[PDB]
Amino acid sequence: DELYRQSLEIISRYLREQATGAKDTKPMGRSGATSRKALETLRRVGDGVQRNHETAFQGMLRKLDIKNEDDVKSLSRVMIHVFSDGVTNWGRIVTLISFGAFVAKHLKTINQESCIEPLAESITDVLVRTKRDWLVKQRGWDGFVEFFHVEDLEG
Ligand SMILES: CO[C@H]1/C=C/CCN(C)C(=O)C[C@](O)(C(=O)NS(=O)(=O)N(C)C)c2ccc3c(c2)N(C[C@@H]2CC[C@H]21)C[C@@]1(CCCc2cc(Cl)ccc21)CO3
């Protein structure tokens, strides 16, 4: 399952990088160039989403009350409720992942760093297993990269 593997890698790295503030230096697995550009896009676009919706993000985090492993495991049901049961576009996928990074940073702050990789798996499961058809039709991570590609300005 190349799409799942690639998705997990991109999401995991972003969540870890967001939580730790440090870049993972290991190479990507398969489809390295796309996965690298995908991660770079998420850095650009995801950070803005978290700031543009700061207050709503804080409010949802406070409402969820995430303390431990069992609370983190309960999030997949909420993700299916909010994300899966609605229209699909790249914007809503960025929000799924950006709120994930927001939860990841919270987990670091309460010393629950070990729950981050499970969280990343849960997000990936929801994204890939409920939206595979849409993702394939939109060209997967190549389509993601192409969608958010910004052309250089004329100097
Ligand atoms: C009102 O607060 C919202 C913020 C909305 C601003 C962004 N916006 C305009 C959206 O439309 C985001 C949205 O696509 C969405 O549908 N939001 S909404 O249902 O609440 N409503 C249409 C605004 C949208 C798309 C995808 C979302 C999602 C919202 N979640 C709820 C967001 C996090 C703060 C909640 C967050 C959520 C659901 C909550 C649990 C969770 C946990 C993880 Cl680890 C990752 C994601 C999520 C599902 O992912």
Side-chain angles (χ1 to χ4, degrees), residues 64 69-84 96 118-119 121-127 130:
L64 292 166
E69 183 168 25
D70 300 348
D71 289 326
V72 172
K73 285 179 175 193
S74 69
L75 294 173
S76 81
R77 183 183 182 186
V78 190
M79 291 186 271
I80 293 296
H81 190 109
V82 172
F83 171 75
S84 301
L96 175 74
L119 168 71
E121 191 163 42
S122 292
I123 294 167
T124 307
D125 286 344
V126 169
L127 178 57
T130 74

mmCIF file with all atom_site columns, all heavy atoms in Angstrom, residues 64 69-84 96 118-119 121-127 130:
data_model
loop_
_atom_site.group_PDB
_atom_site.id
_atom_site.type_symbol
_atom_site.label_atom_id
_atom_site.label_alt_id
_atom_site.label_comp_id
_atom_site.label_asym_id
_atom_site.label_entity_id
_atom_site.label_seq_id
_atom_site.pdbx_PDB_ins_code
_atom_site.Cartn_x
_atom_site.Cartn_y
_atom_site.Cartn_z
_atom_site.occupancy
_atom_site.B_iso_or_equiv
_atom_site.pdbx_formal_charge
_atom_site.auth_seq_id
_atom_site.auth_comp_id
_atom_site.auth_asym_id
_atom_site.auth_atom_id
_atom_site.pdbx_PDB_model_num
ATOM 1   N N   . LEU A 1 64  ? -11.618 18.679 24.004 1.00 0.00 ? 64  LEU A N   1
ATOM 2   C CA  . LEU A 1 64  ? -11.229 17.265 23.906 1.00 0.00 ? 64  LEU A CA  1
ATOM 3   C C   . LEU A 1 64  ? -10.538 16.727 25.166 1.00 0.00 ? 64  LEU A C   1
ATOM 4   O O   . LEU A 1 64  ? -10.633 15.535 25.455 1.00 0.00 ? 64  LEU A O   1
ATOM 5   C CB  . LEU A 1 64  ? -10.328 17.041 22.685 1.00 0.00 ? 64  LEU A CB  1
ATOM 6   C CG  . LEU A 1 64  ? -11.012 17.222 21.325 1.00 0.00 ? 64  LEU A CG  1
ATOM 7   C CD1 . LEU A 1 64  ? -9.992  17.324 20.199 1.00 0.00 ? 64  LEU A CD1 1
ATOM 8   C CD2 . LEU A 1 64  ? -11.999 16.096 21.069 1.00 0.00 ? 64  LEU A CD2 1
ATOM 9   N N   . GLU A 1 69  ? -2.796  8.110  26.575 1.00 0.00 ? 69  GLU A N   1
ATOM 10  C CA  . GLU A 1 69  ? -2.971  7.186  25.450 1.00 0.00 ? 69  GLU A CA  1
ATOM 11  C C   . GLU A 1 69  ? -4.432  6.908  25.094 1.00 0.00 ? 69  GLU A C   1
ATOM 12  O O   . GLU A 1 69  ? -4.797  6.931  23.921 1.00 0.00 ? 69  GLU A O   1
ATOM 13  C CB  . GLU A 1 69  ? -2.265  5.858  25.752 1.00 0.00 ? 69  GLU A CB  1
ATOM 14  C CG  . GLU A 1 69  ? -2.315  4.849  24.610 1.00 0.00 ? 69  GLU A CG  1
ATOM 15  C CD  . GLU A 1 69  ? -1.384  3.664  24.817 1.00 0.00 ? 69  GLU A CD  1
ATOM 16  O OE1 . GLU A 1 69  ? -1.055  3.351  25.983 1.00 0.00 ? 69  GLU A OE1 1
ATOM 17  O OE2 . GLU A 1 69  ? -0.986  3.040  23.808 1.00 0.00 ? 69  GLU A OE2 1
ATOM 18  N N   . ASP A 1 70  ? -5.254  6.637  26.105 1.00 0.00 ? 70  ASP A N   1
ATOM 19  C CA  . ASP A 1 70  ? -6.661  6.280  25.889 1.00 0.00 ? 70  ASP A CA  1
ATOM 20  C C   . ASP A 1 70  ? -7.462  7.433  25.276 1.00 0.00 ? 70  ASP A C   1
ATOM 21  O O   . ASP A 1 70  ? -8.340  7.202  24.446 1.00 0.00 ? 70  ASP A O   1
ATOM 22  C CB  . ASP A 1 70  ? -7.322  5.842  27.205 1.00 0.00 ? 70  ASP A CB  1
ATOM 23  C CG  . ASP A 1 70  ? -6.642  4.626  27.843 1.00 0.00 ? 70  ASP A CG  1
ATOM 24  O OD1 . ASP A 1 70  ? -5.809  3.964  27.182 1.00 0.00 ? 70  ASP A OD1 1
ATOM 25  O OD2 . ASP A 1 70  ? -6.946  4.336  29.020 1.00 0.00 ? 70  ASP A OD2 1
ATOM 26  N N   . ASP A 1 71  ? -7.165  8.664  25.700 1.00 0.00 ? 71  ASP A N   1
ATOM 27  C CA  . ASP A 1 71  ? -7.783  9.863  25.121 1.00 0.00 ? 71  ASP A CA  1
ATOM 28  C C   . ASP A 1 71  ? -7.373  10.033 23.662 1.00 0.00 ? 71  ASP A C   1
ATOM 29  O O   . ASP A 1 71  ? -8.200  10.370 22.823 1.00 0.00 ? 71  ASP A O   1
ATOM 30  C CB  . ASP A 1 71  ? -7.380  11.130 25.893 1.00 0.00 ? 71  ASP A CB  1
ATOM 31  C CG  . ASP A 1 71  ? -8.013  11.220 27.280 1.00 0.00 ? 71  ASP A CG  1
ATOM 32  O OD1 . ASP A 1 71  ? -9.165  10.772 27.464 1.00 0.00 ? 71  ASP A OD1 1
ATOM 33  O OD2 . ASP A 1 71  ? -7.350  11.775 28.185 1.00 0.00 ? 71  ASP A OD2 1
ATOM 34  N N   . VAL A 1 72  ? -6.093  9.814  23.373 1.00 0.00 ? 72  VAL A N   1
ATOM 35  C CA  . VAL A 1 72  ? -5.577  9.915  22.008 1.00 0.00 ? 72  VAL A CA  1
ATOM 36  C C   . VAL A 1 72  ? -6.230  8.862  21.104 1.00 0.00 ? 72  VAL A C   1
ATOM 37  O O   . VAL A 1 72  ? -6.601  9.162  19.970 1.00 0.00 ? 72  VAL A O   1
ATOM 38  C CB  . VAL A 1 72  ? -4.036  9.796  21.966 1.00 0.00 ? 72  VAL A CB  1
ATOM 39  C CG1 . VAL A 1 72  ? -3.535  9.693  20.534 1.00 0.00 ? 72  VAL A CG1 1
ATOM 40  C CG2 . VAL A 1 72  ? -3.389  10.989 22.675 1.00 0.00 ? 72  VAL A CG2 1
ATOM 41  N N   . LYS A 1 73  ? -6.398  7.645  21.620 1.00 0.00 ? 73  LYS A N   1
ATOM 42  C CA  . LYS A 1 73  ? -7.081  6.580  20.878 1.00 0.00 ? 73  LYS A CA  1
ATOM 43  C C   . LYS A 1 73  ? -8.539  6.927  20.554 1.00 0.00 ? 73  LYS A C   1
ATOM 44  O O   . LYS A 1 73  ? -9.059  6.531  19.511 1.00 0.00 ? 73  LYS A O   1
ATOM 45  C CB  . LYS A 1 73  ? -7.021  5.262  21.654 1.00 0.00 ? 73  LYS A CB  1
ATOM 46  C CG  . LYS A 1 73  ? -5.658  4.594  21.617 1.00 0.00 ? 73  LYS A CG  1
ATOM 47  C CD  . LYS A 1 73  ? -5.649  3.301  22.416 1.00 0.00 ? 73  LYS A CD  1
ATOM 48  C CE  . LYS A 1 73  ? -4.319  2.573  22.276 1.00 0.00 ? 73  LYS A CE  1
ATOM 49  N NZ  . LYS A 1 73  ? -4.391  1.171  22.776 1.00 0.00 ? 73  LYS A NZ  1
ATOM 50  N N   . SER A 1 74  ? -9.188  7.679  21.439 1.00 0.00 ? 74  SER A N   1
ATOM 51  C CA  . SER A 1 74  ? -10.579 8.097  21.233 1.00 0.00 ? 74  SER A CA  1
ATOM 52  C C   . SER A 1 74  ? -10.771 9.114  20.089 1.00 0.00 ? 74  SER A C   1
ATOM 53  O O   . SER A 1 74  ? -11.890 9.324  19.641 1.00 0.00 ? 74  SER A O   1
ATOM 54  C CB  . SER A 1 74  ? -11.151 8.692  22.522 1.00 0.00 ? 74  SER A CB  1
ATOM 55  O OG  . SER A 1 74  ? -10.539 9.936  22.822 1.00 0.00 ? 74  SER A OG  1
ATOM 56  N N   . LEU A 1 75  ? -9.688  9.742  19.633 1.00 0.00 ? 75  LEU A N   1
ATOM 57  C CA  . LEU A 1 75  ? -9.788  10.791 18.610 1.00 0.00 ? 75  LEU A CA  1
ATOM 58  C C   . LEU A 1 75  ? -10.207 10.304 17.226 1.00 0.00 ? 75  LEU A C   1
ATOM 59  O O   . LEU A 1 75  ? -10.774 11.073 16.456 1.00 0.00 ? 75  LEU A O   1
ATOM 60  C CB  . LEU A 1 75  ? -8.467  11.551 18.489 1.00 0.00 ? 75  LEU A CB  1
ATOM 61  C CG  . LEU A 1 75  ? -8.094  12.369 19.728 1.00 0.00 ? 75  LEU A CG  1
ATOM 62  C CD1 . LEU A 1 75  ? -6.695  12.941 19.565 1.00 0.00 ? 75  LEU A CD1 1
ATOM 63  C CD2 . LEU A 1 75  ? -9.118  13.467 19.979 1.00 0.00 ? 75  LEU A CD2 1
ATOM 64  N N   . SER A 1 76  ? -9.925  9.049  16.883 1.00 0.00 ? 76  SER A N   1
ATOM 65  C CA  . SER A 1 76  ? -10.281 8.581  15.543 1.00 0.00 ? 76  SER A CA  1
ATOM 66  C C   . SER A 1 76  ? -11.801 8.673  15.319 1.00 0.00 ? 76  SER A C   1
ATOM 67  O O   . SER A 1 76  ? -12.254 9.101  14.252 1.00 0.00 ? 76  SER A O   1
ATOM 68  C CB  . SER A 1 76  ? -9.728  7.176  15.265 1.00 0.00 ? 76  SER A CB  1
ATOM 69  O OG  . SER A 1 76  ? -10.549 6.185  15.839 1.00 0.00 ? 76  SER A OG  1
ATOM 70  N N   . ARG A 1 77  ? -12.588 8.329  16.333 1.00 0.00 ? 77  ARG A N   1
ATOM 71  C CA  . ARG A 1 77  ? -14.040 8.480  16.252 1.00 0.00 ? 77  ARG A CA  1
ATOM 72  C C   . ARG A 1 77  ? -14.451 9.932  15.985 1.00 0.00 ? 77  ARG A C   1
ATOM 73  O O   . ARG A 1 77  ? -15.373 10.183 15.210 1.00 0.00 ? 77  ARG A O   1
ATOM 74  C CB  . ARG A 1 77  ? -14.705 7.991  17.543 1.00 0.00 ? 77  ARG A CB  1
ATOM 75  C CG  . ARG A 1 77  ? -16.222 8.051  17.512 1.00 0.00 ? 77  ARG A CG  1
ATOM 76  C CD  . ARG A 1 77  ? -16.848 7.630  18.839 1.00 0.00 ? 77  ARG A CD  1
ATOM 77  N NE  . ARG A 1 77  ? -18.311 7.642  18.774 1.00 0.00 ? 77  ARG A NE  1
ATOM 78  C CZ  . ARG A 1 77  ? -19.123 7.432  19.811 1.00 0.00 ? 77  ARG A CZ  1
ATOM 79  N NH1 . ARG A 1 77  ? -18.636 7.189  21.027 1.00 0.00 ? 77  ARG A NH1 1
ATOM 80  N NH2 . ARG A 1 77  ? -20.438 7.464  19.632 1.00 0.00 ? 77  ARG A NH2 1
ATOM 81  N N   . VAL A 1 78  ? -13.776 10.881 16.635 1.00 0.00 ? 78  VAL A N   1
ATOM 82  C CA  . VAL A 1 78  ? -14.092 12.291 16.445 1.00 0.00 ? 78  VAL A CA  1
ATOM 83  C C   . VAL A 1 78  ? -13.658 12.743 15.045 1.00 0.00 ? 78  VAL A C   1
ATOM 84  O O   . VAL A 1 78  ? -14.380 13.490 14.380 1.00 0.00 ? 78  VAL A O   1
ATOM 85  C CB  . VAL A 1 78  ? -13.444 13.194 17.522 1.00 0.00 ? 78  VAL A CB  1
ATOM 86  C CG1 . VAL A 1 78  ? -13.997 14.612 17.415 1.00 0.00 ? 78  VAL A CG1 1
ATOM 87  C CG2 . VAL A 1 78  ? -13.700 12.644 18.927 1.00 0.00 ? 78  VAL A CG2 1
ATOM 88  N N   . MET A 1 79  ? -12.501 12.269 14.580 1.00 0.00 ? 79  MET A N   1
ATOM 89  C CA  . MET A 1 79  ? -12.034 12.617 13.225 1.00 0.00 ? 79  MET A CA  1
ATOM 90  C C   . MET A 1 79  ? -12.996 12.109 12.145 1.00 0.00 ? 79  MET A C   1
ATOM 91  O O   . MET A 1 79  ? -13.306 12.818 11.187 1.00 0.00 ? 79  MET A O   1
ATOM 92  C CB  . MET A 1 79  ? -10.637 12.058 12.964 1.00 0.00 ? 79  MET A CB  1
ATOM 93  C CG  . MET A 1 79  ? -9.530  12.714 13.774 1.00 0.00 ? 79  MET A CG  1
ATOM 94  S SD  . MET A 1 79  ? -7.894  12.127 13.294 1.00 0.00 ? 79  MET A SD  1
ATOM 95  C CE  . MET A 1 79  ? -7.670  10.710 14.360 1.00 0.00 ? 79  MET A CE  1
ATOM 96  N N   . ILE A 1 80  ? -13.452 10.869 12.290 1.00 0.00 ? 80  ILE A N   1
ATOM 97  C CA  . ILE A 1 80  ? -14.449 10.319 11.369 1.00 0.00 ? 80  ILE A CA  1
ATOM 98  C C   . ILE A 1 80  ? -15.722 11.174 11.377 1.00 0.00 ? 80  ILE A C   1
ATOM 99  O O   . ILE A 1 80  ? -16.309 11.446 10.332 1.00 0.00 ? 80  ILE A O   1
ATOM 100 C CB  . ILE A 1 80  ? -14.785 8.851  11.718 1.00 0.00 ? 80  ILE A CB  1
ATOM 101 C CG1 . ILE A 1 80  ? -13.571 7.942  11.470 1.00 0.00 ? 80  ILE A CG1 1
ATOM 102 C CG2 . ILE A 1 80  ? -15.976 8.373  10.913 1.00 0.00 ? 80  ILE A CG2 1
ATOM 103 C CD1 . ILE A 1 80  ? -13.150 7.866  10.019 1.00 0.00 ? 80  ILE A CD1 1
ATOM 104 N N   . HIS A 1 81  ? -16.136 11.596 12.564 1.00 0.00 ? 81  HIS A N   1
ATOM 105 C CA  . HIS A 1 81  ? -17.321 12.432 12.740 1.00 0.00 ? 81  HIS A CA  1
ATOM 106 C C   . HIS A 1 81  ? -17.163 13.749 12.017 1.00 0.00 ? 81  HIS A C   1
ATOM 107 O O   . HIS A 1 81  ? -18.008 14.119 11.196 1.00 0.00 ? 81  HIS A O   1
ATOM 108 C CB  . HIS A 1 81  ? -17.565 12.657 14.236 1.00 0.00 ? 81  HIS A CB  1
ATOM 109 C CG  . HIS A 1 81  ? -18.887 13.302 14.563 1.00 0.00 ? 81  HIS A CG  1
ATOM 110 N ND1 . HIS A 1 81  ? -19.892 12.626 15.146 1.00 0.00 ? 81  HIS A ND1 1
ATOM 111 C CD2 . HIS A 1 81  ? -19.341 14.601 14.380 1.00 0.00 ? 81  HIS A CD2 1
ATOM 112 C CE1 . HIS A 1 81  ? -20.945 13.451 15.317 1.00 0.00 ? 81  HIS A CE1 1
ATOM 113 N NE2 . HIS A 1 81  ? -20.607 14.657 14.844 1.00 0.00 ? 81  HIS A NE2 1
ATOM 114 N N   . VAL A 1 82  ? -16.065 14.450 12.276 1.00 0.00 ? 82  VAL A N   1
ATOM 115 C CA  . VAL A 1 82  ? -15.900 15.813 11.765 1.00 0.00 ? 82  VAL A CA  1
ATOM 116 C C   . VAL A 1 82  ? -15.323 15.871 10.349 1.00 0.00 ? 82  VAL A C   1
ATOM 117 O O   . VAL A 1 82  ? -15.892 16.537 9.470  1.00 0.00 ? 82  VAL A O   1
ATOM 118 C CB  . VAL A 1 82  ? -15.061 16.668 12.738 1.00 0.00 ? 82  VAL A CB  1
ATOM 119 C CG1 . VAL A 1 82  ? -14.732 18.018 12.125 1.00 0.00 ? 82  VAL A CG1 1
ATOM 120 C CG2 . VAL A 1 82  ? -15.820 16.839 14.049 1.00 0.00 ? 82  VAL A CG2 1
ATOM 121 N N   . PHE A 1 83  ? -14.205 15.181 10.125 1.00 0.00 ? 83  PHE A N   1
ATOM 122 C CA  . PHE A 1 83  ? -13.546 15.191 8.811  1.00 0.00 ? 83  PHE A CA  1
ATOM 123 C C   . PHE A 1 83  ? -14.208 14.295 7.758  1.00 0.00 ? 83  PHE A C   1
ATOM 124 O O   . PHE A 1 83  ? -14.556 14.782 6.683  1.00 0.00 ? 83  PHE A O   1
ATOM 125 C CB  . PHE A 1 83  ? -12.065 14.815 8.933  1.00 0.00 ? 83  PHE A CB  1
ATOM 126 C CG  . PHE A 1 83  ? -11.403 14.591 7.611  1.00 0.00 ? 83  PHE A CG  1
ATOM 127 C CD1 . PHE A 1 83  ? -11.072 15.663 6.809  1.00 0.00 ? 83  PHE A CD1 1
ATOM 128 C CD2 . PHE A 1 83  ? -11.159 13.305 7.150  1.00 0.00 ? 83  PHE A CD2 1
ATOM 129 C CE1 . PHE A 1 83  ? -10.478 15.465 5.580  1.00 0.00 ? 83  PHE A CE1 1
ATOM 130 C CE2 . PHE A 1 83  ? -10.562 13.098 5.924  1.00 0.00 ? 83  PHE A CE2 1
ATOM 131 C CZ  . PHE A 1 83  ? -10.224 14.178 5.134  1.00 0.00 ? 83  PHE A CZ  1
ATOM 132 N N   . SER A 1 84  ? -14.357 12.990 8.035  1.00 0.00 ? 84  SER A N   1
ATOM 133 C CA  . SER A 1 84  ? -14.860 12.057 7.017  1.00 0.00 ? 84  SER A CA  1
ATOM 134 C C   . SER A 1 84  ? -16.268 12.393 6.539  1.00 0.00 ? 84  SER A C   1
ATOM 135 O O   . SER A 1 84  ? -16.551 12.328 5.342  1.00 0.00 ? 84  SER A O   1
ATOM 136 C CB  . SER A 1 84  ? -14.821 10.597 7.506  1.00 0.00 ? 84  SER A CB  1
ATOM 137 O OG  . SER A 1 84  ? -13.502 10.232 7.846  1.00 0.00 ? 84  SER A OG  1
ATOM 138 N N   . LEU A 1 96  ? -7.206  18.725 8.933  1.00 0.00 ? 96  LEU A N   1
ATOM 139 C CA  . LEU A 1 96  ? -7.091  17.470 9.663  1.00 0.00 ? 96  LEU A CA  1
ATOM 140 C C   . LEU A 1 96  ? -5.681  17.292 10.182 1.00 0.00 ? 96  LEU A C   1
ATOM 141 O O   . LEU A 1 96  ? -5.457  16.975 11.355 1.00 0.00 ? 96  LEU A O   1
ATOM 142 C CB  . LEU A 1 96  ? -7.434  16.282 8.748  1.00 0.00 ? 96  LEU A CB  1
ATOM 143 C CG  . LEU A 1 96  ? -7.254  14.859 9.286  1.00 0.00 ? 96  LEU A CG  1
ATOM 144 C CD1 . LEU A 1 96  ? -8.354  14.512 10.294 1.00 0.00 ? 96  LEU A CD1 1
ATOM 145 C CD2 . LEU A 1 96  ? -7.295  13.866 8.122  1.00 0.00 ? 96  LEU A CD2 1
ATOM 146 N N   . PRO A 1 118 ? 1.349   7.059  17.475 1.00 0.00 ? 118 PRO A N   1
ATOM 147 C CA  . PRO A 1 118 ? -0.013  6.536  17.391 1.00 0.00 ? 118 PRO A CA  1
ATOM 148 C C   . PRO A 1 118 ? -1.006  7.540  16.808 1.00 0.00 ? 118 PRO A C   1
ATOM 149 O O   . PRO A 1 118 ? -1.882  7.154  16.018 1.00 0.00 ? 118 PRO A O   1
ATOM 150 C CB  . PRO A 1 118 ? -0.381  6.246  18.846 1.00 0.00 ? 118 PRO A CB  1
ATOM 151 C CG  . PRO A 1 118 ? 0.909   6.049  19.548 1.00 0.00 ? 118 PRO A CG  1
ATOM 152 C CD  . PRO A 1 118 ? 2.001   6.701  18.750 1.00 0.00 ? 118 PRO A CD  1
ATOM 153 N N   . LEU A 1 119 ? -0.883  8.809  17.211 1.00 0.00 ? 119 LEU A N   1
ATOM 154 C CA  . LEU A 1 119 ? -1.778  9.863  16.727 1.00 0.00 ? 119 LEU A CA  1
ATOM 155 C C   . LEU A 1 119 ? -1.628  9.985  15.209 1.00 0.00 ? 119 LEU A C   1
ATOM 156 O O   . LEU A 1 119 ? -2.627  10.059 14.489 1.00 0.00 ? 119 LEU A O   1
ATOM 157 C CB  . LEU A 1 119 ? -1.488  11.201 17.435 1.00 0.00 ? 119 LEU A CB  1
ATOM 158 C CG  . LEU A 1 119 ? -2.098  12.522 16.918 1.00 0.00 ? 119 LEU A CG  1
ATOM 159 C CD1 . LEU A 1 119 ? -3.598  12.602 17.162 1.00 0.00 ? 119 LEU A CD1 1
ATOM 160 C CD2 . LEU A 1 119 ? -1.403  13.713 17.575 1.00 0.00 ? 119 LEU A CD2 1
ATOM 161 N N   . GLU A 1 121 ? -0.594  7.764  13.113 1.00 0.00 ? 121 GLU A N   1
ATOM 162 C CA  . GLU A 1 121 ? -1.177  6.574  12.505 1.00 0.00 ? 121 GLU A CA  1
ATOM 163 C C   . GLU A 1 121 ? -2.691  6.705  12.411 1.00 0.00 ? 121 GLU A C   1
ATOM 164 O O   . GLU A 1 121 ? -3.283  6.363  11.395 1.00 0.00 ? 121 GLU A O   1
ATOM 165 C CB  . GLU A 1 121 ? -0.810  5.336  13.333 1.00 0.00 ? 121 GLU A CB  1
ATOM 166 C CG  . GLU A 1 121 ? -1.146  4.017  12.662 1.00 0.00 ? 121 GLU A CG  1
ATOM 167 C CD  . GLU A 1 121 ? -0.415  2.845  13.302 1.00 0.00 ? 121 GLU A CD  1
ATOM 168 O OE1 . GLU A 1 121 ? -0.335  2.807  14.552 1.00 0.00 ? 121 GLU A OE1 1
ATOM 169 O OE2 . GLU A 1 121 ? 0.082   1.973  12.554 1.00 0.00 ? 121 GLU A OE2 1
ATOM 170 N N   . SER A 1 122 ? -3.311  7.220  13.468 1.00 0.00 ? 122 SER A N   1
ATOM 171 C CA  . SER A 1 122 ? -4.761  7.394  13.495 1.00 0.00 ? 122 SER A CA  1
ATOM 172 C C   . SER A 1 122 ? -5.240  8.392  12.449 1.00 0.00 ? 122 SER A C   1
ATOM 173 O O   . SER A 1 122 ? -6.271  8.177  11.806 1.00 0.00 ? 122 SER A O   1
ATOM 174 C CB  . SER A 1 122 ? -5.222  7.855  14.876 1.00 0.00 ? 122 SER A CB  1
ATOM 175 O OG  . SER A 1 122 ? -5.022  6.812  15.807 1.00 0.00 ? 122 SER A OG  1
ATOM 176 N N   . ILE A 1 123 ? -4.501  9.485  12.291 1.00 0.00 ? 123 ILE A N   1
ATOM 177 C CA  . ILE A 1 123 ? -4.841  10.481 11.295 1.00 0.00 ? 123 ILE A CA  1
ATOM 178 C C   . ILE A 1 123 ? -4.720  9.863  9.894  1.00 0.00 ? 123 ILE A C   1
ATOM 179 O O   . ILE A 1 123 ? -5.615  10.015 9.055  1.00 0.00 ? 123 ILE A O   1
ATOM 180 C CB  . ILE A 1 123 ? -3.941  11.720 11.386 1.00 0.00 ? 123 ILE A CB  1
ATOM 181 C CG1 . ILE A 1 123 ? -4.173  12.473 12.706 1.00 0.00 ? 123 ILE A CG1 1
ATOM 182 C CG2 . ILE A 1 123 ? -4.203  12.640 10.200 1.00 0.00 ? 123 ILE A CG2 1
ATOM 183 C CD1 . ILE A 1 123 ? -3.106  13.510 12.978 1.00 0.00 ? 123 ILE A CD1 1
ATOM 184 N N   . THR A 1 124 ? -3.608  9.180  9.651  1.00 0.00 ? 124 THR A N   1
ATOM 185 C CA  . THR A 1 124 ? -3.372  8.517  8.383  1.00 0.00 ? 124 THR A CA  1
ATOM 186 C C   . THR A 1 124 ? -4.449  7.484  8.063  1.00 0.00 ? 124 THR A C   1
ATOM 187 O O   . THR A 1 124 ? -4.897  7.414  6.923  1.00 0.00 ? 124 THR A O   1
ATOM 188 C CB  . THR A 1 124 ? -2.006  7.805  8.345  1.00 0.00 ? 124 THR A CB  1
ATOM 189 O OG1 . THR A 1 124 ? -0.966  8.724  8.709  1.00 0.00 ? 124 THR A OG1 1
ATOM 190 C CG2 . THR A 1 124 ? -1.739  7.279  6.949  1.00 0.00 ? 124 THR A CG2 1
ATOM 191 N N   . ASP A 1 125 ? -4.839  6.676  9.051  1.00 0.00 ? 125 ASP A N   1
ATOM 192 C CA  . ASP A 1 125 ? -5.914  5.694  8.860  1.00 0.00 ? 125 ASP A CA  1
ATOM 193 C C   . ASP A 1 125 ? -7.200  6.369  8.414  1.00 0.00 ? 125 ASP A C   1
ATOM 194 O O   . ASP A 1 125 ? -7.841  5.936  7.454  1.00 0.00 ? 125 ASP A O   1
ATOM 195 C CB  . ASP A 1 125 ? -6.194  4.893  10.140 1.00 0.00 ? 125 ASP A CB  1
ATOM 196 C CG  . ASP A 1 125 ? -5.127  3.859  10.438 1.00 0.00 ? 125 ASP A CG  1
ATOM 197 O OD1 . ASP A 1 125 ? -4.320  3.517  9.536  1.00 0.00 ? 125 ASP A OD1 1
ATOM 198 O OD2 . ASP A 1 125 ? -5.088  3.393  11.600 1.00 0.00 ? 125 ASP A OD2 1
ATOM 199 N N   . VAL A 1 126 ? -7.587  7.434  9.108  1.00 0.00 ? 126 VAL A N   1
ATOM 200 C CA  . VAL A 1 126 ? -8.808  8.149  8.750  1.00 0.00 ? 126 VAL A CA  1
ATOM 201 C C   . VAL A 1 126 ? -8.714  8.739  7.335  1.00 0.00 ? 126 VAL A C   1
ATOM 202 O O   . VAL A 1 126 ? -9.646  8.614  6.528  1.00 0.00 ? 126 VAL A O   1
ATOM 203 C CB  . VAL A 1 126 ? -9.147  9.244  9.788  1.00 0.00 ? 126 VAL A CB  1
ATOM 204 C CG1 . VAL A 1 126 ? -10.262 10.151 9.266  1.00 0.00 ? 126 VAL A CG1 1
ATOM 205 C CG2 . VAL A 1 126 ? -9.565  8.605  11.113 1.00 0.00 ? 126 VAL A CG2 1
ATOM 206 N N   . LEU A 1 127 ? -7.594  9.379  7.028  1.00 0.00 ? 127 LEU A N   1
ATOM 207 C CA  . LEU A 1 127 ? -7.431  10.031 5.727  1.00 0.00 ? 127 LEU A CA  1
ATOM 208 C C   . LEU A 1 127 ? -7.452  9.029  4.567  1.00 0.00 ? 127 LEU A C   1
ATOM 209 O O   . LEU A 1 127 ? -8.252  9.151  3.625  1.00 0.00 ? 127 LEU A O   1
ATOM 210 C CB  . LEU A 1 127 ? -6.135  10.815 5.706  1.00 0.00 ? 127 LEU A CB  1
ATOM 211 C CG  . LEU A 1 127 ? -5.770  11.539 4.415  1.00 0.00 ? 127 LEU A CG  1
ATOM 212 C CD1 . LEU A 1 127 ? -6.857  12.522 3.983  1.00 0.00 ? 127 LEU A CD1 1
ATOM 213 C CD2 . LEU A 1 127 ? -4.442  12.255 4.610  1.00 0.00 ? 127 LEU A CD2 1
ATOM 214 N N   . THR A 1 130 ? -10.705 6.296  4.547  1.00 0.00 ? 130 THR A N   1
ATOM 215 C CA  . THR A 1 130 ? -12.024 6.843  4.257  1.00 0.00 ? 130 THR A CA  1
ATOM 216 C C   . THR A 1 130 ? -12.070 7.714  2.997  1.00 0.00 ? 130 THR A C   1
ATOM 217 O O   . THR A 1 130 ? -13.146 8.007  2.510  1.00 0.00 ? 130 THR A O   1
ATOM 218 C CB  . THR A 1 130 ? -12.635 7.587  5.478  1.00 0.00 ? 130 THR A CB  1
ATOM 219 O OG1 . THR A 1 130 ? -11.995 8.857  5.691  1.00 0.00 ? 130 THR A OG1 1
ATOM 220 C CG2 . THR A 1 130 ? -12.531 6.717  6.740  1.00 0.00 ? 130 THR A CG2 1
#
